[PDB]
Structure formats: C-alpha cells, structure tokens
Amino acid sequence: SGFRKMAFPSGKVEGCMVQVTCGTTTLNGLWLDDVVYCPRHVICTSEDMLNPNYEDLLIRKSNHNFLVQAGNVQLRVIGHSMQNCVLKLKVDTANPKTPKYKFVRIQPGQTFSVLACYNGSPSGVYQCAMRPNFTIKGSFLNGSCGSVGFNIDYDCVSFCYMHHMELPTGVHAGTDLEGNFYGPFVDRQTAQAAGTDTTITVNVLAWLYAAVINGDRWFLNRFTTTLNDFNLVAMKYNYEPLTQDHVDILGPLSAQTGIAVLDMCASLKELLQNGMNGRTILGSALLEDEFTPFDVVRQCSGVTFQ
C-alpha cells in the first residue's frame, strides 16, 4: 500500500552522463554508443546566448574545441554535427554502459524521470510531467542543461527529454533527443512565452483511482455525469478536455475498482466546483496530475524493469 511519485531507477542513465566543455562553457552530455548528445548552446558564451547564430558559431569551432569528460577519462571528439538544437559530438570510444535505448517524442501529459546532473555527474532523480504547454517544472541549477528525461520499458530506456533552458519565468524548456524543442521555444536568452498551462485531466482521474485503490474513498459521490457535461466544467477550471481515448485508457482502472470512468468524472467535477475543503487525497491538498494511468497501474501492480 501507499503512493509516492516514484522515479524510474536511474542506473542505466547514470552511466551515460558525461561532461561537455566547449569554450569555458560546460554542461552535461548523453553518451550513447559513439555519440555524445548535448545542447548546442554549449558553444555559446553568456553574450552569445542573447542572439546566437548557431551555424556561424559552430563553424568557428572544431572537434578539438570540445572536451567531453566522463569521470577521470576524456573522450576524443572526432566529429561534430548539429541536429536541430542538439549537438551530436561523435567521440572515439563507444560507451560500454550503453543500454538498449530508444528516442521518443512524448506527448503533453506524459510523465518521465529526470536525472539532474552537474559537470556530468548525477545529483538526483525526480519524476515530472510534460505540461500541456510543453514546459516542465523541474529543479535545474546553472550547468544542469543537458540533463535528460527518460522512461524505462522493462529493458529499454526511452530518452524523451534533454534540458536546455530555464525561461525567465523559472519554468524549464528542452528538446527531444533529435533536438526538436518541446513547445514553441528556441535556445536563445530572450523572453519566450509558454502557453496557458492546463491540468492534465486523465492523470487526475488516474490518481483518484490510485486514491481509491489505497483507501481514500471520501470523494466518491452520489452523482453521475456525461463526457460532454464534464468537459464543460473542466474547461472552466483549466482542465484539459476528456476524450473517449482517455476513457478507454482508464478502462483497466475502472475494472479493478468497479467504478466507471464517467462516475469518477462526476466525483472529479464535484471536487472542482466545491473544493477539497480542508481534506486531503493520498496525502495531498491539491489535485495531482503528474501520474498517468500507466503510472498508477505500474505502481499499483509492481512492474519491474530489467
């Protein structure tokens, strides 16, 4: 019993974190096989960040200008290539600790673990969601750029996020591992707007189901509702709309608990309009949206990873 945010075990990623140093700029890189992936703004100085011409900046750099260090060993850069916002630094040694990996572009509302690193060394791991506005509310200090987000599908590490920027609003922005930013952000020190963030409704519902599995039942109400009625209330509170695909995803949770998705939706609706109201759910005084339905099933069923 019990419920915790729970990050994926980080070991397979820890052996892939490296330090990249360009011209006195140093951040983290991801060493997979013979390639180190890192934010292309490694090549930037504080002044360049204000208005960088990355192509012009990169042309003034050569393989020898990149100092990739892994513990007490240094990799030799034999090649460098810019894919969107990622620098692909081809090094001479394939990472012996390279796990079975995949690059995935996740969707807003999915969760993943972040391995926060500094100077290529791991400091901590935490679980977070991609907000609907494609930002993440992480914990990133100077030099943590290039820290990566990941999921683990048993034996396979799915890298889904590389940290690039802290926006002046203190939220974090980054790319997939192909260097395509999540959201409309660019790697420049300029004011950039993130959209209105919304709460991830399907995640809240999965968490309510977690609460039911773990004994918190006070919010189950005596009312019901339809999808169209619920979405009308959800839109008012900045909750993402619920689709039939969301209902179908919650099916297993509904079957385990005997509570139909639409009945849970009516419980949520009440919580939205009338509050929690001194009371807590799974220890929380706020509705939690950083658990997907798969996270709940995973944690409630004990899914292991090789």
Add this chain to the structure above:
Amino acid sequence: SGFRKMAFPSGKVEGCMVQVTCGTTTLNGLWLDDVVYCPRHVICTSEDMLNPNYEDLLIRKSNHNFLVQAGNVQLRVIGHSMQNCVLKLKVDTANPKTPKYKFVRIQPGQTFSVLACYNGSPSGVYQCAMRPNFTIKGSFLNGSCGSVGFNIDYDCVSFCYMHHMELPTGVHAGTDLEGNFYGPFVDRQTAQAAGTDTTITVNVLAWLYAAVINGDRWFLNRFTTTLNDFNLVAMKYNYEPLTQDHVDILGPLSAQTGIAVLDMCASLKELLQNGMNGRTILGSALLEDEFTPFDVVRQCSGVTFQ
C-alpha cells in the same frame, strides 16, 4: 531554479538488489561483498508470520534452503546467520558492483531514498523521511520487503533502512542494516502501534528557506518571536520542538537568505495558527517536512556524487 523532492541516483544500489527465496517465500536482498542481507521473515510462511519463533524456524532451515538469484544467475549460500531481524546469507561470490558503503542508523526526521524492488528487480525510487514515530510512509506492495533506503555521501552509499513490514495501518516499518528495528516494532503479523506522528519542524523551516531562495516570499511576516514562544505554539500543532542545535543547523540558510532563524520561526508560527489559506508554497498547499536543511543546501547548491 525550482524545487523537487529529488531522490539520490539509484545506480549504485541497483547493482546490489537480489532476490531471496526460502520456502516459496521470495523477497529482496542486499548483496554487499559476500553477504546478502534480507528480512529474516523470508523464512516465514503466511501462517508463521502470526507468531514466529525465529530461532526455531531458522534451525529448521539450511544454507541449501536459500535461493538467492541476481538476474539470470544464482548465488550459492554457504552460510547463514541471524543478526537481530536481518538474515545475513553468506554467499559464494562477492558482488562485483559492491560500492563503497556504510551502515548508518539514522535519526527521526532524516531523509533517504528508497529503491522499491520486487523479485530483486528495481521498480522505482523515491525520497522520504523517517517520521518522528520511526515509521515511513512509502509505497510497498507484496514482495517489496528487503527494499533498502540509502543516502549518498559523494562516493559512499550509506544504507540506513531495510523494509520489513506494512503495519495494518498501511504505514511501513523496518530496520537499520544491523537489523535493529526503527521504533518499537517487531517482525510479526500482529497489531502494532506507532506513536503519534509529529511534523519535523527543522525540515519545515529548511523548506521555507528553499521557498525564499526560489522566489516564494509571501509568508515572510512583520513579526518575530523567541525559541520558547515558538516551541509553545509548535507543540500545539504536533510539531517537534526546536532546539539550539536546530538553529545552528539552519545557520547557512539564514546567511544565504539574510533571514534569521528566529524570524523564519515567526513566519512559521503565523502559518501554523492562521493557515496558508488558499495559497501555496513551492507548489504545495501543505507545509512540507521531508526536506532536511542539508537537502535544501544540496539541491540549492548542486552537490554532485561520484
């Protein structure tokens, strides 16, 4: 910027988790050098748990009755020994991935990371505190006993907790790695009372300091107070009393923020008596006590671990 619970990177512990199987009972074990540590109640069946004579039960077992598996390899038990509530299973192979480690008995209010395991395989990692009543509010399903709690002092893993029991109240109980339970609990399927839990005041104060470092300043008040006055209010709300040692621990936070510990205490006192009150701190609607002053400094300063 930003603040997250943050667990320690788990890699060094992942390579120490093994599966122990006695008589169709299987839980997790900790493989350090040539010894596997696991809850002695591995030797128990569901019926034995109600009233086990561990000495009598263990005498009916022999080394050959213990099946320690690590992935697709099995260790051979050459020796077994009972230290308090821990079984020390001496195996034939020293764990090649044995990190520099220490066993520590932590104090109530300290935090540590838990690597939740099933069948000796890691499922997730999360950070938690030892409650003042020596329980932990974790997430543990059947078969997660023997999962371990740990801290990382740069290069050194400090094992501080092994999970043994879920109490009928759904909270979790366990031992240090010498098998001495935390709290007055025993490894028997019987109703056992945990004390009144209190909030860890020094941790709340460190978290308020985190909130100040990260921009949340609305709770700084226009009042002050003394230690004796504050503890009088804290006792009323089930907050642990503050000592001068607690003040001294918070010194660095006071120096970074320019806010004296006793002034932060006055802010806390107000929050206690008058509430938060629709408002949040670091995203939270409840006062958080699972960050120690060292956790805050660690996360605000970017401490790396080898």
